Amino acid sequence: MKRAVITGLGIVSSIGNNQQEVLASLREGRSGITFSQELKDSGMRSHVWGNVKLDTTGLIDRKVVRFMSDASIYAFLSMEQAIADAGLSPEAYQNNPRVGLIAGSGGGSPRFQVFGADAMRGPRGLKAVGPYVVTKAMASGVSACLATPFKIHGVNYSISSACATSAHCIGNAVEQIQLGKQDIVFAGGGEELCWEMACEFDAMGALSTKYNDTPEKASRTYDAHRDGFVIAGGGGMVVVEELEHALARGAHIYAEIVGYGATSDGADMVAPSGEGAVRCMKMAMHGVDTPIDYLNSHGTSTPVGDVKELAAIREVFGDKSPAISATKAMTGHSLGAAGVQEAIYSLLMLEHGFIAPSINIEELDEQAAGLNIVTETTDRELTTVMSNSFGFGGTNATLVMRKLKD
Amino acid sequence: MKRAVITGLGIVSSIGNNQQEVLASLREGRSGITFSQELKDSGMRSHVWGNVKLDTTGLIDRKVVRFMSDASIYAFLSMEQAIADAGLSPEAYQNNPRVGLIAGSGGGSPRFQVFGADAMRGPRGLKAVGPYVVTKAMASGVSACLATPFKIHGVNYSISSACATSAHCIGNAVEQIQLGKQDIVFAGGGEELCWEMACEFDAMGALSTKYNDTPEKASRTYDAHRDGFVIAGGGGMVVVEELEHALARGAHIYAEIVGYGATSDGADMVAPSGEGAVRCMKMAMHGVDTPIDYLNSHGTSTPVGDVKELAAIREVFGDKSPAISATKAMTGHSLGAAGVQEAIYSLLMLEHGFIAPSINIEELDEQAAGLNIVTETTDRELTTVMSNSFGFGGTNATLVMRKLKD
Ligand SMILES: *C(=O)CCCCCCC
Ligand SMILES: *C(=O)CCCCCCC
Ligand SMILES: [N+]
Ligand SMILES: [N+]
């Protein structure tokens, strides 16, 4: 009955390029959303996005970054952070069959998939395509482009489940620890930000389009006038480690993954059923007898989704409603990367004793009446936290993390 | 730790639209490669592929297929076959938290990703893109598009690992049964066939280009004159079930998954290290008290690749090499769907007592000497079979299946 703990974390987000910058943003309720000329020039209605403010040029060995797409790059940088944060020397995690990596993305790389088709149809054909498009566009790019340069010898693959992707990745890593198959598994994911993929969401009306003049107000989970989520890009990675192994080397422990839920709606393709989320959270709560002090919701700032999840939460907790805040109101929706990025925001809140505000709620949706939705940064000692991730296809994931004594 | 057996299978392949057609092709050593006008027109050098010879029009409900890409369609049809072949009905596998789905693809849908970009860049913009591109293009399309219409309530996500994709899905399904989380998990995957994706492989010189005039001979694993693999499309799906649960319902049991290996090279991005394959195979043989009677190699018909695996196999078995066959010689490389399709070819061989032929070996590579490579359909009573699946990024998967024994 092996225990799984998080001993290191790394992040590249719209609101910060390391845990310190992210910490400050969360505490200040600072938005990472900006106006995107690229999205506007593509012909989209949504002209806002949660972009990574960082020129990654030269941050990765050329011989290595040549095979990578943005999703892989973001995850790579995140992993470097997590390795250092975990205090793992090369000899400690490299060429070690007991050390694996499970990380993916929601869309792989639409940009390079399109680059290849465009190049191929041009005057140069194959010569224009080049020999690096496959590793960049394949769905497992995120895991393949990291496992190889990091000398990973254990498990190596990507779990993909739309907006639940990185959450499932972390959960699966936990399972590897529980099966005694691995001592350490770097888990997380990444996602590129481009009109190529964005227009696809805009074309189904999933993106916000009425607040382009005021980018930082576009993402407004629970607000009565929300009109879709704000697409974002970025990456995240956490070090899931077996408890004894962690203690033995004196690793710093953020928390223990005491609960992992993964269910399926078997209902609608792009809308949640809520019934599945209820089972997902309940599964994650099995054997967890401490109260959930804070719930980092999936809340993407969409009309149907936001309240559907609030309803499931009600069903699960009843008059025991935990503090709730939707960090996407600040960060935007990083899709496949949201799972790990939000587990990190939750771990930071747990580590530093505070609840990040759910911003831009000028008028609370009436269906959210009677819930403890935190709208102002609040200091508080937290012990157990829950984070939800739901994606198209009715795929659900929930992670419950708890502080260890002393 | 509970046991997992396969109680049903389904397949849409270049050599068959079902297990009967697949069985007939394998024993006959029939090829599924054809000349592709599409590949030639796109400007590629490789003009051959293993296409699915099936008019899928009207095979899937209008409201269901509208969200699907070819990879999803192939997997869906495979699942329908698996369900019927398993003897399961809606009342038993639908709306059941104890039944899940783990299936994926290698590249999601480059075709619909390119369609979205092409359409968006047109004068109609968002209107031309339509509201169904995300579910077709997202990496988790294969699992999302199946779990929803089939009403799955248990796990629901895609494992993606290039050419090892569907093999990892199966092993992960096994882990769900071993963890006691699920009683049944439909596992496998699919992959579309299009110049959009194929041209990326040609651009890196991975595809055969010298036999465009003799299609059925282009794919020739282990032949000294091999020159890259032949890309293919299709799907596969097996019903992974807990032992007691299967016996209790008088289910037909093809075999038990007695071994599952998953490792990482941590070396080259597009080339195998061999060291990883060795560990992967030994991991899947740990505890197996029976010898490997047959081995369905990864063998894609590439210069370095083919020989690297053989070297790994000699390293594992020494002088006790099992009968070896590379079915890709007649089917082609279905990338993400290869793992499950080849797991199925193996189950059929184990079920019908025979070893399919490794065709097109006009001249055996010298580095292949000393091994037992079967080049003729041979009747034999197998008990324990092994299937290997390797992918870019140094991702290795190995599955060992055996006749049932309580
Ligand atoms: C989240 O579930 C919405 C769908 C994201 C899919 C990944 C991007 C193609
Ligand atoms: C097999 O490992 C070769 C790469 C397959 C990627 C499929 C998506 C482009
Ligand atoms: N979350
Ligand atoms: N195989």
Three-state SS string over chain A comes to CCCEEEEEEEEEECCECCHHHHHHHHHHCCCCEEECHHHHHHCCCCCEEECCCCCCCCCCCHHHHCCCCHHHHHHHHHHHHHHHHHCCCHHHHCCCCCEEEEEECCCCCHHHHHHHHHHHCCCCCHHHHCCCHHHHHCCCHHHHHHHCCCCCCCCEEEEECHHHHHHHHHHHHHHHHHCCCCCEEEEEEEECCCHHHHHHHHCCCCECCCCCCCHHHHCCCCECCCCCECEECEEEEEEEEEHHHHHHCCCCCCEEEEEEEEEECCCCCCCCCCHHHHHHHHHHHCCCCCCCCEEECCCCCCHHHHHHHHHHHHHHHHHHCCEEECCHHHHCECHHHHHHHHHHHHHHHHHHCEECCCCCCCCECHHHCCCCECCCCEECCCCEEEEEEEECCCEEEEEEEECCCC
One domain, residues B121 and B235 = yes
One domain, residues B54 and B167 = yes
One domain, residues A121 and A215 = yes
Q: Is A225 a catalytic residue?
A: no
Residue A113 contacts residue B110 (beta carbons within 8 Å): yes
Q: Judge whether A334 lies within some domain.
A: yes
**Ranges assigned E (strand) in B16-155:** 34-35, 48-49, 99-104
| Residue with CA closest to ligand 1 atom 7 | A106
Q: Which of B97, B105, B202 sits opposite A279 (nearest CB)?
A: B97
Residue B346 contacts residue B241 (beta carbons within 8 Å): no
- Rounded to whole angstroms, how far apart are CA atoms B330 and B352? 19
Q: Longest Cα pair distance anywhere in chain A, in angstroms? A: 66
Exposed, middle or buried, A182 (CB in 10 Å: 0-12/13-18/19+)? Answer: buried
Is B43's CB within 8 Å of A168's CB? no
One domain, residues B141 and B247 = yes
User: How does strand A294-296 pair with strand A378-379?
Assistant: unpaired
- Rounded to whole angstroms, how far apart are CA atoms B97 and B94? 9
A134 lines ligand 2 (CB under 6 A): yes
Is A393's CB within 8 Å of B144's CB? yes
Name the strand (E) or helix (H) holding B275: helix B275-285
Q: How far is the CA of B297 from the centre of ligand 4 (A)?
A: 4
Domain count, chain B: 2
Is A262's CB within 8 Å of B155's CB? yes
Q: Judge whether A280 lies within some domain.
A: yes
* A55 contact partners, CB below 8 Å, separation of at least 6: none
Last residue of a domain, one of A243, A259, A275: A259
Residue for token pair 């730790």? B1
One domain, residues B318 and B386 = yes
User: 3-state DSSP call for residue B62?
Assistant: helix
One domain, residues B184 and B57 = yes
Q: Is A245 a catalytic residue?
A: no
Q: Judge whether B1 lies within some domain.
A: no
Q: Judge whether A403 lies within some domain.
A: yes
One domain, residues A240 and A320 = no
Angle at A90 between CA A86 and CA A93, to 5 degrees: 65
Query: Of residues A145, A163, A169, A199, which has the active-site annotation?
Result: A163
User: 3-state DSSP call for residue B105?
Assistant: coil
Is B175's CB within 8 Å of A178's CB? no
End-to-end Cα, chain B, rounded Å: 14
Tell me how crowded residue B128 is: count the other CB atoms within 10 A of its CB: 15
Residues of A in contact with B394 (CB under 8 A): 144, 147-148, 156
Is A160's CB within 8 Å of B150's CB? no
End-to-end Cα, chain A, rounded Å: 22
**Ranges assigned E (strand) in B230-362:** 234-242, 255-264, 294-296, 323-325, 354-355
- Rounded to whole angstroms, how far apart are CA atoms A345 and A354? 11
Name the closest ligand to CA B328. 4
Q: Is B352 a catalytic residue?
A: no
Last residue of a domain, one of B235, B259, B283: B259
One domain, residues A362 and A301 = yes
Q: Judge whether A1 lies within some domain.
A: no
Angle at B170 between CA B167 and CA B175, to 5 degrees: 125
One domain, residues A301 and A365 = yes
Name the strand (E) or helix (H) holding B188: strand B184-191
- Rounded to whole angstroms, how far apart are CA atoms A160 and B116? 21
Q: Judge whether A397 lies within some domain.
A: yes
Q: What is the CATH number of the domain that holds B373?
A: 3.40.47.10
- Rounded to whole angstroms, how far apart are CA atoms B148 and B124? 31
B389 lines ligand 4 (CB under 6 A): yes
Q: Which of B106, B144, B200 sits opposite A162 (nearest CB)?
A: B144
B359 lines ligand 2 (CB under 6 A): no
Angle at B296 between CA B291 and CA B297, to 5 degrees: 110
Is B199's CB within 8 Å of A135's CB? no
Question: In Å, how far are A221, A372, A383, A393, B280 from A349, measured between CA atoms?
Answer: 19, 17, 10, 30, 40
Q: Judge whether B341 lies within some domain.
A: yes
Last residue of a domain, one of A244, A259, A274: A259
Instruction: Give the 3-state secondary structure of B337-390.
Output: HHHHHHHHHHHHHHHCCEECCCCCCCCECHHHCCCCECCCCEECCCCEEEEEEE
Residue A320 contacts residue A359 (beta carbons within 8 Å): no
Q: How many CB pairs under 8 A join A and B?
A: 310
For A102, name the nearest residue in chain B, comparing CA atoms only: B159
Among B375, B7, B383, B397, CA closest to B183: B7
Among B214, B230, B324, CA closest to B15: B230
One domain, residues A242 and A330 = no
One domain, residues B314 and B402 = yes
- Rounded to whole angstroms, how far apart are CA atoms B110 and A109? 9
Q: Judge whether B15 lies within some domain.
A: yes
Q: How far is the CA of A390 from the centre of ligand 3 (A)?
A: 9
| Residue with CA closest to ligand 1 atom 5 | A162
Range of the domain at B384: 260-406
For B44, name the nearest residue in chain A, comparing CA atoms only: A126
One domain, residues A26 and A169 = yes
Q: How far is the CA of A103 from the centre of ligand 4 (A)?
A: 24
What experimental approach yielded this model? Answer: X-ray
